[PDB]
Amino acid sequence: DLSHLTPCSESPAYQAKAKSFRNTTSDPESGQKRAESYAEALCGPEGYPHLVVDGRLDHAGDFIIPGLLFLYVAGWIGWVGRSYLIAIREEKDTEMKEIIIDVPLAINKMLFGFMWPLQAFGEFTSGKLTVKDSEIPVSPR
Amino acid sequence: IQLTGTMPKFGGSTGGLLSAADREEKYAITWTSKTEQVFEMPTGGAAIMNEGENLLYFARKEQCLALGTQLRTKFKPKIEDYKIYRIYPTGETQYLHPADGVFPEKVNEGREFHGKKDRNIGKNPEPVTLKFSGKTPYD
Amino acid sequence: IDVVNHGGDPQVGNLSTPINGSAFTKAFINALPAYRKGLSPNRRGLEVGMAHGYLLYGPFAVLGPLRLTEYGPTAGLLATIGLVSILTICLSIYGAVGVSKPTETLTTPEVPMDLATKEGWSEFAGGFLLGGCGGAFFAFFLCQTPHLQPLIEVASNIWS
Amino acid sequence: SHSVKIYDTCIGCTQCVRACPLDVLEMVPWDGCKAGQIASSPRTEDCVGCKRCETACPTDFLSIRVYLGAETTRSMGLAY
Amino acid sequence: KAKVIVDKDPVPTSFEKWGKPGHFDRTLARGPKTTTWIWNLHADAHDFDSQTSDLEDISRKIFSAHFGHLAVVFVWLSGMYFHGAKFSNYSAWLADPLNIKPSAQVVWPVVGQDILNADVGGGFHGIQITSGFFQLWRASGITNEYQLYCTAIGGLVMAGLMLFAGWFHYHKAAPKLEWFQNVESMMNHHLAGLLGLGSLGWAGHQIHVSLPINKLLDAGVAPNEIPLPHEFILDPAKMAELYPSFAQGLTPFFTLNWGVYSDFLTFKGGLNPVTGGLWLSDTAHHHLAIAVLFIIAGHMYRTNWGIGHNMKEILEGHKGPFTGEGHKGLYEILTTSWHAQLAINLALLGSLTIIVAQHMYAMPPYPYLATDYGTQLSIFTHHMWIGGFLIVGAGAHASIFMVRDYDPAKNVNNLLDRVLRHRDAIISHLNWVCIWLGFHSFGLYIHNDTMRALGRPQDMFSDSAIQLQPVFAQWIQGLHAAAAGATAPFASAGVSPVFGGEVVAVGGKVAMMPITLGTADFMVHHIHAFTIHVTVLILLKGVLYSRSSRLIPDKAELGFRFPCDGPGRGGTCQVSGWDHVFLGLFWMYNSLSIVIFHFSWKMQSDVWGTVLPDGSVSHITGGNFAQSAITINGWLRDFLWAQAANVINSYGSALSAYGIMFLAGHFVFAFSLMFLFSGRGYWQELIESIVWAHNKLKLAPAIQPRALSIVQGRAVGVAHYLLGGIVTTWAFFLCRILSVG
Amino acid sequence: AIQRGSKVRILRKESYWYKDVGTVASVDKSGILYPVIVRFDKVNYNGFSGSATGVNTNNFAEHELEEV
Amino acid sequence: QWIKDPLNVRPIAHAIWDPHFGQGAVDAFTQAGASSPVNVAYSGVYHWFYTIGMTNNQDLYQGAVFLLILSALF
Numbered sequence A: 001d002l003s004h005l006t007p008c009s010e011s012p013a014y015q016a017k018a019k020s021f022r023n024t025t026s027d028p029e030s031g032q033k034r035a036e037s038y039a040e041a042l043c044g045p046e047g048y049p050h051l052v053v054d055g056r057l058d059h060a061g062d063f064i065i066p067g068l069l070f071l072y073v074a075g076w077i078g079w080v081g082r083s084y085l086i087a088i089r090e091e092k093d094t095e096m097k098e099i100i101i102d103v104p105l106a107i108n109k110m111l112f113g114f115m116w117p118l119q120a121f122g123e124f125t126s127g128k129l130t131v132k133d134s135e136i137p138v139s140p141r
Numbered sequence B: 001i002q003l004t005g006t007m008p009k010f011g012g013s014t015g016g017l018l019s020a021a022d023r024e025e026k027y028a029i030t031w032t033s034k035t036e037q038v039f040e041m042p043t044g045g046a047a048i049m050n051e052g053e054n055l056l057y058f059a060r061k062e063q064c065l066a067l068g069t070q071l072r073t074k075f076k077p078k079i080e081d082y083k084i085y086r087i088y089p090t091g092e093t094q095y096l097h098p099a100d101g102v103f104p105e106k107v108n109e110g111r112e113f114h115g116k117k118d119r120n121i122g123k124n125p126e127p128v129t130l131k132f133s134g135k136t137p138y139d
Numbered sequence C: 001i002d003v004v005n006h007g008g009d010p011q012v013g014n015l016s017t018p019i020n021g022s023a024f025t026k027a028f029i030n031a032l033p034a035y036r037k038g039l040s041p042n043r044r045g046l047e048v049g050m051a052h053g054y055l056l057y058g059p060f061a062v063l064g065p066l067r068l069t070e071y072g073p074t075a076g077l078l079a080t081i082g083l084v085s086i087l088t089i090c091l092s093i094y095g096a097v098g099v100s101k102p103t104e105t106l107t108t109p110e111v112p113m114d115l116a117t118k119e120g121w122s123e124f125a126g127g128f129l130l131g132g133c134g135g136a137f138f139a140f141f142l143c144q145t146p147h148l149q150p151l152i153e154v155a156s157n158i159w160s
Numbered sequence D: 001s002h003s004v005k006i007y008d009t010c011i012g013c014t015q016c017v018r019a020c021p022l023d024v025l026e027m028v029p030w031d032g033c034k035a036g037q038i039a040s041s042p043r044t045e046d047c048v049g050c051k052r053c054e055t056a057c058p059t060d061f062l063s064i065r066v067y068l069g070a071e072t073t074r075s076m077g078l079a080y
Numbered sequence E: 001k002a003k004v005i006v007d008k009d010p011v012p013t014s015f016e017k018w019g020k021p022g023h024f025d026r027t028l029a030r031g032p033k034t035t036t037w038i039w040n041l042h043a044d045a046h047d048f049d050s051q052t053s054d055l056e057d058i059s060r061k062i063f064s065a066h067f068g069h070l071a072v073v074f075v076w077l078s079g080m081y082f083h084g085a086k087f088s089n090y091s092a093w094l095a096d097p098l099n100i101k102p103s104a105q106v107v108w109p110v111v112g113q114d115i116l117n118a119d120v121g122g123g124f125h126g127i128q129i130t131s132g133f134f135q136l137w138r139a140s141g142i143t144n145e146y147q148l149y150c151t152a153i154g155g156l157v158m159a160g161l162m163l164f165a166g167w168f169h170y171h172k173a174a175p176k177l178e179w180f181q182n183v184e185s186m187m188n189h190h191l192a193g194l195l196g197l198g199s200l201g202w203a204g205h206q207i208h209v210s211l212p213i214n215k216l217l218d219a220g221v222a223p224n225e226i227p228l229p230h231e232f233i234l235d236p237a238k239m240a241e242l243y244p245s246f247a248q249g250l251t252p253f254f255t256l257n258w259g260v261y262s263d264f265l266t267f268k269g270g271l272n273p274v275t276g277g278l279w280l281s282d283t284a285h286h287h288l289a290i291a292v293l294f295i296i297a298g299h300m301y302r303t304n305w306g307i308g309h310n311m312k313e314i315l316e317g318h319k320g321p322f323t324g325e326g327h328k329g330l331y332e333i334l335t336t337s338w339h340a341q342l343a344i345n346l347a348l349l350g351s352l353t354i355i356v357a358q359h360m361y362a363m364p365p366y367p368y369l370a371t372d373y374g375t376q377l378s379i380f381t382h383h384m385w386i387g388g389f390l391i392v393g394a395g396a397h398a399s400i401f402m403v404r405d406y407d408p409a410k411n412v413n414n415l416l417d418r419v420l421r422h423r424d425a426i427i428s429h430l431n432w433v434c435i436w437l438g439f440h441s442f443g444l445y446i447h448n449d450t451m452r453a454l455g456r457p458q459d460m461f462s463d464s465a466i467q468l469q470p471v472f473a474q475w476i477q478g479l480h481a482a483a484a485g486a487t488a489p490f491a492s493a494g495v496s497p498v499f500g501g502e503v504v505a506v507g508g509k510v511a512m513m514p515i516t517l518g519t520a521d522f523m524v525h526h527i528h529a530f531t532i533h534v535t536v537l538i539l540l541k542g543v544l545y546s547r548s549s550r551l552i553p554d555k556a557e558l559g560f561r562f563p564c565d566g567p568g569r570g571g572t573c574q575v576s577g578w579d580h581v582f583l584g585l586f587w588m589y590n591s592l593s594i595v596i597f598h599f600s601w602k603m604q605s606d607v608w609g610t611v612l613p614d615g616s617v618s619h620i621t622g623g624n625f626a627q628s629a630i631t632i633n634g635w636l637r638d639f640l641w642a643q644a645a646n647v648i649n650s651y652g653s654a655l656s657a658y659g660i661m662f663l664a665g666h667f668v669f670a671f672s673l674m675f676l677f678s679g680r681g682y683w684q685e686l687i688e689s690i691v692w693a694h695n696k697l698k699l700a701p702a703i704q705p706r707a708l709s710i711v712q713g714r715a716v717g718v719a720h721y722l723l724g725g726i727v728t729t730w731a732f733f734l735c736r737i738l739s740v741g
Numbered sequence F: 001a002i003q004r005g006s007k008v009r010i011l012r013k014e015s016y017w018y019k020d021v022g023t024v025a026s027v028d029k030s031g032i033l034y035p036v037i038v039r040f041d042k043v044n045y046n047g048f049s050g051s052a053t054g055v056n057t058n059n060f061a062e063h064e065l066e067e068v
Numbered sequence G: 001q002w003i004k005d006p007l008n009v010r011p012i013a014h015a016i017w018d019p020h021f022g023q024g025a026v027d028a029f030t031q032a033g034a035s036s037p038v039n040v041a042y043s044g045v046y047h048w049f050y051t052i053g054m055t056n057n058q059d060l061y062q063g064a065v066f067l068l069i070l071s072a073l074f
């Protein structure tokens, strides 16, 4: 239940720090906005917010939402890269547009890269995502 | 045998023969040229190929063939007639580089198979087969 | 006029510069105990050891842990004796391994044939021992007997 | 002395012999190649081990292969 | 003999080659099969000799690339003047230069970097700059920010003009080869026309602009009632009310009555007591004197009219018995090889930049330069680093000359041939003097560590212990302190307060003190000589053994930049001339780090500090160089541990970016050792393991991933090493001196 | 079945393109050990350090191959 | 001395005999209640010996002699 971690509003070390939060942007009340926004976290004896990473809810915003957001964005980047790499193979001049990127193909790969997990599941169930161990270069033992 | 040759006009350097040349072995290169030109010694600096036939001494075989490569390439008269010898301090001379009289990159009859394996390099025995013996897996 | 020539053989890796072999360095290197014509070993070693033992009582006598103490000259003598003994052990084992004929250069066209054998280098080592002990003791006696000798005040005021 | 071993996957391009700086290698006639020649290493006691012959070999794995073994005064390439 | 001849439109201006990378090399044009193509694209982009074999095309490329480099430098200079004009407190700094720090860069508040805007005075928040631009503009007579804005606009116009000239001299009218061979005309126009006319124009500016504006500034007039420099020329009455010898005209110049110009052309020598800089009358007189000397020197060489020298008979006549033939062949070397010219020019520019560093600290040329310790420390450190880099590049290009441009046919029995012939005697005696200097410069520190550790303070090499007083340098200091009035009878003071005299102090801080040299200075100067000598040993060994050695005799055919010849001959690793530059970069790092450490400790302990009202000087550290700069533990404790208390406690303050850069440089130094210690064959096999995992998911790249080459691995390692160490020392120095200075 | 232009997979373990598919440039009909010249899309490691080029063809035997 | 006050007395590993010490190092390394330059033990075998049953120096001496006999036996 994390009795050692108190909420930052009830913690009497966070309230001493929260007066002297510096402004980060040009907004004059940015320190006060940070102070009110970090009060819902858990603070230790230092008076600083802590993040609990075990997938629980009311602390899913620490890791689960940023983690799923990164997984979507990184899957977007990797899937668009893999799609471009596959698309530039079977047209007999691949190093030149590996080094000088074909922009009209890359734009069509990028803007249609939002549906990366559906295409990933389709290629996984279709077997066209993973190359079989026979048709692949392997170093000598 | 006895190496009839005159030395190129060289000013003398510090990269030449050391004490082991007169005690272990030294090497010589003799070459005939029909013109007088300037060459670079592996010893260091530049010397003069005088008209006629030349004899130089070096401490290593690699210095002699580094000179012989400079005699073959990079010269317009295209000197190939060079011979490389080894002189031991006893006095014995061994004629080394053009043994058949032809350069090794040109094939010649009378040369036998040395170091030739009638097997693929991947088809080599494992060292675990050849444990505790003098034989190594490339034999 | 080329004052820097070869030694007579250009393809040998050396040059006959004024410092190397001109007129005054061929002599005085051929006239040192090593490379002198008439000396035997245990005489070359005697001269070399005497010079070395005499010079080595300079950075031990006034430069040591005891140099502010009256035992300082005696400790410098003992340190010189110890260094001469270590160098004699080094010479003895160098000979006992087995020596070759010494390197002939432009400065020294003739090297001592008597130092090309193990027996000659043993005589050289014994002469070095006796010479080093004698030179160290002579320098100790000279530095100690006036008990101040203000030449030692020079280069100890420098090495304060 | 090093061991320069020439294997039977040799196309006889003579690049190893021209790349060799101490005349270790030469060409011998050979019936098992299109070029009619294979490399041989007779005076392999002069091999320093620079592997310039292994650098110049155009086979997928090298038909000429240098094994660094016992070190002599010629394998070290010492002028002294 | 010297005429202008060009080719009209030799290279068309088209964008078709912009989209074809690797066009300059034949090997780079086949296409990127491996990732080594990408690194070879940048490694050989500027190597114009490997691109074309014609020296005329190479010289044309070099001449047109110089204009692009000058355009880049002019964009940089215009950016600095624009930052002074728009984002600086220069107008605030001119009012109160003793309590307002120079700042010329504000930081945008998007994250918590708004703390990086230091409170420097005058209601301005920004980064305290240490470049010395503010003192330079005060010495230039710049009073308002509009004069900086005009100079920034002029810098942009000049940068565009240089870009247009670079396009013009490669695509419209490109000079021939013999337009470059006549170095006689080039050197005459660089001595008289560039250095001579440039210093004459600056002497005229310092007469007409810098001197009256700076005399009114030192007299106590606020800069916005100070008249603009153009009514000093338009109205000579205001110019002649101060320094009243402008009442008479230019005729005493032409009747050789130069003495009446002595009020504004002085030879005072010392520092200005008001500002702490050199007298601007001394600088104007200096620029006039060297302008006349450079213009005279620019009439030495024969160009078109018979009078002059040809720089060949000078070389032909210089020959002795120890050399024989002499300098014959050197004119052809320096007129056919660009690399020999770069090796000479880069060495002299590096030693020149080191001279600039060693001179501007002792004789500060600018008002309030010595007062701001951060500016002085930063310009000294920056110019040492630039100078050492240029010296190592000179060693590099000498090595590139020896295998790519040296011809043994033109060099028989001259100086270069004989240097190659006794290179063993050169390198072995240099090796001996490096070993001797290492023992008798570092073993003194080791002995001092040992006797200070063993409780033997009387057995050390100290001022209280066995002394090692530098009697020659102290004698030279005594000669310079007594030089004014005895050997320089018309100097008011010495050239610098370093050699003697009194404490020159401005405000409450010391401008300069006498710098007494003791045992610690002797020992650290011998370490300076040692490290310089080892850098010379590595670079000169790379130069002399560039073509051949006893190990690899056929090393010129391998090239300047090759990794090795193989594991044979014991292993011929790092035999090339490039790898000696690679090691000499580490040794210049070591050398110049010890130089700037000696500077940053000696000036902080014995020169810099505050002046008590009694008259004594309380220094920054407290004069601990006499007793702690003799031990490595003293250098670790009283210099590195003690003075880095500012860079590590800088977090949450205005200098926290320096602590960030301190840690970042530590990271990059540690990151360098992955490339420096490891080798290519590990990483190629690791990339082979990664390629299979890409092949498993159809992620095989067309350009096959290779590990970095051995030379590129060494280059990446040494660049990261130098970057991480230099950033660390920059951060440590600047955060220390922005807290204690 | 081995003919010029046929795509074929390498069975030499030590080859760079082990279990990789390349085309046939020429097959030699004389009695030599490795008659099938096979050219690949990728390039070998071969070359000096820093060399951007490499070989992409080699001779192979009949038993060292399989037709796809 | 250490078994009387294990929390205050510093354990001594061995004595120092150095010809290179000055007076300052002899005075500095004369520690842990000794009259000689000694080294302070940081391996902590003193705690081990006190725990396993060693009380006096004779029980350590007989253990050292027994270990010498065991090493000779091996």
Ligand code: CLA
Pocket: A077, A078, A079, A080, A081, A082, A084, A085, A101, A106, A109, E689, E690, E693, E694, E697, E699
């Ligand atoms: C299409 C691009 C792409 C894809 C999807 C992959 C995917 C893979 N890589 Mg990666 N990688 C790539 C490019 C790519 N990489 C590049 C450019 C580099 C060189 C820096 C590497 C070097 C590399 C290493 C060293 C390792 C991986 C690993 C892996 C695996 C785990 C993911 C990971 O660790 O990411 C790590 C990703 C990086 C370190 C760099 C990725 C760079 C960007 C994000 C790639 C996408 C941008 C691309 C340049 C342009 C897209 C094309 C566009 C024009 C449409 C996974 C199979 C690991 C593995 O084998 O796990 C099984 C492994 O150890 N990769």
Ligand code: CLA
Pocket: E131, E132, E133, E135, E136, E348, E349, E352, E353, E356, E360, E366, E379, E382, E386
């Ligand atoms: C990486 C390159 C680099 C960088 C970024 C800078 C940057 C800096 N330099 Mg620097 N410099 C360098 C290389 C570098 N320099 C080199 C290679 C030299 C040797 C020529 C110098 C010599 C130099 C001097 C002498 C001074 C600067 C100063 C400055 C600072 C202000 C810039 C300015 O406007 O000064 C403007 C300064 C001037 C216009 C005076 C320079 C006039 C010189 C004496 C004439 C040189 C003529 C010619 C170009 C060189 C010919 C060489 C000859 C042997 C043939 C700044 C920190 C100044 C400074 O520290 O002020 C606080 C300063 O006075 N630098």
Ligand code: CLA
Pocket: E042, E043, E044, E045, E046, E047, E048, E342, E346, E389, E390, E392, E393, E394, E396, E397, E400, E560, E561, E578, E581, E585, E719, E723
């Ligand atoms: C007037 C100056 C001058 C000139 C123009 C030359 C000219 C040249 N040099 Mg160089 N050189 C010099 C100074 C000079 N150099 C100095 C100062 C060094 C000492 C380090 C050397 C050392 C040297 C060597 C060792 C070699 C050359 C070579 C080259 C040639 C091609 C350069 C190239 O394409 O590489 C372009 C490569 C780069 C631009 C990469 C540089 C990467 C640096 C480390 C980054 C810059 C530092 C920066 C502040 C880091 C910021 C990090 C941040 C972005 C995160 C060309 C002849 C090469 C040659 O001729 O090959 C045969 C060669 O190998 N140079």
Ligand code: CLA
Pocket: E431, E432, E434, E435, E436, E437, E438, E439, E442, E443, E446, E534, E537, E538, E583, E584, E586, E587
């Ligand atoms: C602290 C680090 C360190 C040390 C000790 C050395 C040591 C050495 N470097 Mg350097 N170097 C280093 C790091 C180091 N380097 C790294 C990082 C690189 C950069 C890549 C290299 C690369 C390098 C090159 C490229 C070169 C050297 C050379 C040298 C030598 C200079 C000669 C000298 O000073 O002799 C004196 C020795 C010292 C000052 C070391 C301290 C020894 C003390 C003073 C004496 C103690 C001995 C002791 C009493 C013996 C008795 C003990 C007994 C039990 C055995 C020396 C052996 C140069 C060389 O060999 O030519 C001369 C040279 O060419 N260095």
Ligand SMILES: CC1=C(/C=C/C(C)=C/C=C/C(C)=C/C=C/C=C(C)/C=C/C=C(C)/C=C/C2=C(C)CCCC2(C)C)C(C)(C)CCC1
Pocket: C050, C051, C052, C054, C055, C130, C131, C133, C134, C135, C137, C138
């Ligand atoms: C000349 C010359 C030189 C040299 C110098 C020197 C180096 C010197 C040294 C010197 C020395 C270094 C000396 C020494 C001396 C020694 C001696 C003098 C010894 C003696 C001894 C003795 C006599 C002893 C005895 C004894 C004995 C034997 C035993 C018993 C005891 C006794 C002790 C008695 C030079 C090079 C510059 C060059 C020029 C010239």
Ligand code: SF4
Pocket: D004, D019, D020, D021, D022, D023, D024, D025, D046, D047, D048, D049, D050, D051, D052, D053, D054, D066, E568
């Ligand atoms: S390793 Fe070098 S010397 Fe030996 S055979 Fe190969 S190329 Fe010749």
Ligand code: SF4
Pocket: D006, D009, D010, D011, D012, D013, D014, D015, D016, D017, D038, D039, D053, D056, D057, D058, D059, D062, D063, D064
């Ligand atoms: S380099 Fe290799 S393939 Fe070419 S001839 Fe020599 S061994 Fe045969």
Ligand code: SF4
Pocket: E563, E564, E565, E566, E567, E571, E572, E573, E574, E679, E710
């Ligand atoms: S380890 Fe690398 S640099 Fe050294 S010899 Fe082998 S390949 Fe060359």
